[PDB]
Amino acid sequence: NYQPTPEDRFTFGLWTVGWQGRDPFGDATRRALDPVESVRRLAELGAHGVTFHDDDLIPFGSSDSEREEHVKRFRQALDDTGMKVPMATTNLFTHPVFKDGGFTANDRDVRRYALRKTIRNIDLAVELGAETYVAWGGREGAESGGAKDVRDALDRMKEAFDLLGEYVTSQGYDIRFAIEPKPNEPRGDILLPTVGHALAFIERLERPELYGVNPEVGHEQMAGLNFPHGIAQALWAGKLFHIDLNGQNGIKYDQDLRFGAGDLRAAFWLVDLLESAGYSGPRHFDFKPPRTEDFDGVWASAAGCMRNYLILKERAAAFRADPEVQEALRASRLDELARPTAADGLQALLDDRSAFEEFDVDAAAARGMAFERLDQLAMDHLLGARG
Amino acid sequence: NYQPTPEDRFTFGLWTVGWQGRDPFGDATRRALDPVESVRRLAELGAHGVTFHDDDLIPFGSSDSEREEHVKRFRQALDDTGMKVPMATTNLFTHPVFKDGGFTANDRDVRRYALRKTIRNIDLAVELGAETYVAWGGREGAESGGAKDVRDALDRMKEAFDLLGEYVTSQGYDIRFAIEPKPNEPRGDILLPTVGHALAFIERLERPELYGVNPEVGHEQMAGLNFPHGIAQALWAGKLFHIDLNGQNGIKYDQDLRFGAGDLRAAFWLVDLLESAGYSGPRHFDFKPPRTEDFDGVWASAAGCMRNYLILKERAAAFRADPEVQEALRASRLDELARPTAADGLQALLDDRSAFEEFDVDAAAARGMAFERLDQLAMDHLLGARG
Amino acid sequence: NYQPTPEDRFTFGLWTVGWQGRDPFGDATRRALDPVESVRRLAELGAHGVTFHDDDLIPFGSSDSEREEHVKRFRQALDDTGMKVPMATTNLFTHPVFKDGGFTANDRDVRRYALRKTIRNIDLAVELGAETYVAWGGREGAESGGAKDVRDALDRMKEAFDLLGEYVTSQGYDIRFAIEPKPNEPRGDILLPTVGHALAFIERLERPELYGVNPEVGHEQMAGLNFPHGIAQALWAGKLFHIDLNGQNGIKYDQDLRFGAGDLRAAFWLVDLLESAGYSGPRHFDFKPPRTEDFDGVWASAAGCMRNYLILKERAAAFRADPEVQEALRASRLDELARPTAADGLQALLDDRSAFEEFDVDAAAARGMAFERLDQLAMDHLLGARG
Amino acid sequence: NYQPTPEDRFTFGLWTVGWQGRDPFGDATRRALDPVESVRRLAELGAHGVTFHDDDLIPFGSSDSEREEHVKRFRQALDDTGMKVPMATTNLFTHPVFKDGGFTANDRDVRRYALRKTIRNIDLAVELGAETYVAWGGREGAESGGAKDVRDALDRMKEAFDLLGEYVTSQGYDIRFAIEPKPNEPRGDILLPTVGHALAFIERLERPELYGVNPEVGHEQMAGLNFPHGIAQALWAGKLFHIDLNGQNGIKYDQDLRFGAGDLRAAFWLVDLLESAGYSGPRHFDFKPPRTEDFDGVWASAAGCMRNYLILKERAAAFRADPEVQEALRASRLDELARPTAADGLQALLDDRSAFEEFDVDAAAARGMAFERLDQLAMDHLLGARG
């Protein structure tokens, strides 16, 4: 009944289930979860692996002595359970020294510090076997306009990612980076607000081949955009190295609801797309069990995630296979969208009088697109009202 | 008293002042303005030139006979007044044959037609002397998810812009293109929603050098982003070929208010940036005098535009020159932002123990950024409360 | 298979299916539909009745002669089909004389005119048998701040509704009014933006008993609010005389998609509420078939509406009846929410030391709310994944 | 040079300047400020008084012994400086026992507890001399739909405010309550989201006369509404007992920027309104110095607040007095808006043939409103470009 298996590629962040529940207007409602503990409960539910921030596994300020002790206990846990670690990131947002940013902070000294803190937790990412490395520059921005020269910051940002590449290139690591956009929160405005702004940025770096994106549901939905639309340009441009799943009800604070929640009609068009294009990386889940819940609630919430994906995957599978849905698509000319417009060459088109001088625009404009039917059909499938 | 002169580069679209006032819920409140008429009133107010859609100058369905008559009358007008035409575009949104799009429409035949309609009004753009050519794909999108394969559409979009380049390359024209993003309205979702999404798209075309952007105030402010932030990546990436100025009060229908209106604190940080980076192209104005106004109102509204830019330009000039503002900037370390972080090389940084092993993070984090003062200063300048 | 019958109370506006497709950036894509024609197709699909604007049935400027001819043809149509007319409204937004508003316009003369135009189409509303009368003040607002004294406008608004009541009171009509809020579009800001702002306004009129609300899905969802939350205060306060159903994808232009579309998880919590509280009025549908469609598309789109309501009604019915959903509710204490907090009186509470001096706050705060389970359950029901 | 004096009525919350800087994604960047310390620095800058949450002055869990010690030290501070305390509130959001709400929480026991916690800090509000008492129900809402019966919650909410009134009525206190709306954050959706939703709620309580509102800038601007528009209905309905000033850049997390910041054109239309209607209560400031700042920054940020109000007050004063602005207003008929529409009675209007049968609608619709000029004038005044 929609049971998950490691072969599904469902992964979680230690900081997701582990969220203690502290929000601007409230203290923590839950007690700390030990990383080994999250790992057994997850493996048990049907996951594949887990992701982490340096600061999640190794507490800030930890000596290299205690630092070994947390990596061994984790190491052992991964083995007794079989879980994997296909992605890792740095924590350049919590500590106060990052109040103005990491790679883009004004204090030059603060920038160097954040470049090392990363390089350090990259040697560990590999040591464990992570394939992708993500970077979320949440403290990279400004509330006021004279606080940041956006042109100077974009320089300090390319210089940061470049160095990192030169490092992985020398260290002959097979790892690749994933830049995660957010339009805002915790800064008034964040650098590289959406997938689009990050994709362009990557075509300016020295080694573009080593960079991609890790678009998150709610984040793109914080600017009011169509998430699936955005996962399309990344794939079209071959840059979807990773993805963060969750829920978001519109434009407002980053909610991070469990997957399926929020915009349900949208999560249906994402799975479909991810299945069609053959996305094989991990189906990550960057969510936060609400603070009105306890631990039995955190595990139910993380169960709902995978389960919602599985059903949606099914309901989408049928959608495409339905012999009737297939003819509606032809009725709406999605087959003609796939066909090149001018494979006949420019010259051919400039002389072809069927495209202008003789085109019957009136007869053509009267041709209905039949989009409302193909949708209600889609709707019956998601609800399971077809039969 | 803030009088404009053609040397300011203020330009307008024939369809701006000429707007008749028809909105979804209302008939037109103003009568049609003849293009020659807009041209004399504008030259009179202190402008430099005007932009246009093929359909603005040459009514849809016009024979090549009447078509010559509108280009001559315009031609003569430009001369008796001295106005110039530094930008031109096609109209792929009004006619019903474009209900599903132009370059990305599903009906292949509709795509070819829209490629020619453009190529035609490109030969005219040059004939007049336009330097830039803009493209706004407003009908390029979908309301439902199965209505468009976003990967197939991005193919038909690259194929469209490519052909156009092959054409201008053969026709040895010195013109360049400008893709204008919009996140939505009139379609539920529009392809290449923001500046970011268009910048990445341009690095995939065959001839990237011939493409740029024409970001519009309200449009980026329809997704809730920081406009100036966005004009920074375009400049940083050298792609600001043109720009559309106007006003927008938040997230909602595209208002197109006169310049200065809407977010005033933002229009102050844009002019400053445009002046600093030395933006020399035109200061275009894509606005719509509200329908509660008559013609004396349309001319006052177009007067307010340039005037607001001029004052803002002044108030920003003083801001930067103020000896006190200059030391606040140093106080907030914008001078250190400009300084490279690791010109000493990767190796130097990996050994430099001043950046990690010995960095005093606590002492550094206690260092205030002093951003609130530099802003109130900025605020006094905009209001003119410094003295 | 989710077939509707007049006993469902599904109604439509003549201006919904009849929409010709003209948007700010496009001419009409469909031809005019004659009112009698909409009436036969609708009765055929399974409806109960239709609503209208004076201007929909009787074209603006029509003489009392032709005016009788449109009311007779309509009259006859209603009979050959059995359809009813349970609601009617005035059209104070299209004509240019309403560019500054109707009841709140500055030109005093324009206000009187709009008061009569209404009183006229009220005598007709009854003549036909409408039970409710709706008022949408879309042109009541301003783009600029000095354009309207909001205190003076609220006076001219109470004076407008008052007079109307004095009229229906004298004409001994059994009709009641329904004020429909919108936060914006076509004006920069609209008076009485949300349900809340209209509910308060009604408690100031002379005859409050004769007024209520007609909240529309997308409209409240244009400000980013929770629609069902809003339909709750209206019912709690006994003011839901009518309702407009449709779809809206977030914050942006008013889409008016068919019902079910947009936020699907929200339309599930609305039907449930409407069924629980026993809402018996009409399940109106104020939507707009998209302009990429033709007539076969307009009828399919209006079919999807009712169908989506029917399924959602079912999936919600099961939800509540599920013996398991019932114990989850008890698990989450919705039964304790219904229980009064201090029926024991103030004094009893001030002495009751179980509520403060001895309350164990720590033990109580540790009590999980179990909300994530009751939701995934809800989710399985909507998708039909329970079994 | 825009210096404030207690006669201006500028007040602050202890929790504003005192904010330590902890946000969802970051630890505190500033150290704790002692209440007596905030009081001396504020009195020094030019304030009138300060507001507080029980939990700000008396730490949660404090014994009645230490509880006296904090009220005496505060008491003395107020005297050595002369500051006043015209408003006080309870803290029903931080502690975890309020994770599901206070007055509306499901656990009945949690509701009683929160009713007492309030009644307690009301006896103290008076003891000090506060005139108004505010209530912000931030934890009153839900993320999921089955988590809360919105009809049951509105019952538990009226029962809460009622009891409080019965208490102040018996305790013969001269105090009055102020309900502060927020559409969201920290809950997915909050009960009584906007000023409108709270105004209606007040007309259902047992003792309406004892209730009002305390609208906050950013909060109403979180739903995308026009703040000044909203302060107009409250005044029109005589319910503006208090107000919270600050800044907010659009729709997103609650920023709480210093006053003047965010939407500057809007803060100009608010002061004008507050000055015209003769608002005499306090000009409260509920803001948060950003966490990139230290203490010298917190005092500069709180200086900018009052200063921005003072200038805006001036620039607005001139606006109204300008002989030219006065004739523009007449030109735009704001004088006719103030004039009653039908003081002649219903009958008079029904017979008056100048309002319909003979009204020249075409001649009337051609009458421009001249709104764009009156605005550019307004703009010149705010910038100080008139002369």
Ligand SMILES: O=C(CO)[C@@H](O)[C@H](O)CO
């Ligand atoms: O996206 C967020 C928060 O909005 C983070 O969890 C990143 O994924 C990791 O830095």
Ligand SMILES: O=C(CO)[C@@H](O)[C@H](O)CO
């Ligand atoms: O931006 C718009 C409308 O939102 C257009 O005026 C383009 O500039 C021209 O197609």
Ligand SMILES: O=C(CO)[C@@H](O)[C@H](O)CO
């Ligand atoms: O709501 C709208 C448009 O947003 C109207 O159809 C009203 O229902 C009738 O005036």
Ligand SMILES: O=C(CO)[C@@H](O)[C@H](O)CO
């Ligand atoms: O408005 C907020 C936070 O958004 C509070 O500071 C209230 O004023 C007090 O509970």
Ligand SMILES: [Mg+2]
């Ligand atoms: Mg997030």
Ligand SMILES: [Mg+2]
């Ligand atoms: Mg994430």
Ligand SMILES: [Mg+2]
């Ligand atoms: Mg625009």
Ligand SMILES: [Mg+2]
């Ligand atoms: Mg434009």
Ligand SMILES: [Mg+2]
């Ligand atoms: Mg609508």
Ligand SMILES: [Mg+2]
């Ligand atoms: Mg409606």
Ligand SMILES: [Mg+2]
């Ligand atoms: Mg706030």
Ligand SMILES: [Mg+2]
């Ligand atoms: Mg507040």
Ligand SMILES: [O-]
């Ligand atoms: O997140």
Ligand SMILES: [O-]
């Ligand atoms: O535009």
Ligand SMILES: [O-]
């Ligand atoms: O509507």
Ligand SMILES: [O-]
């Ligand atoms: O706040």
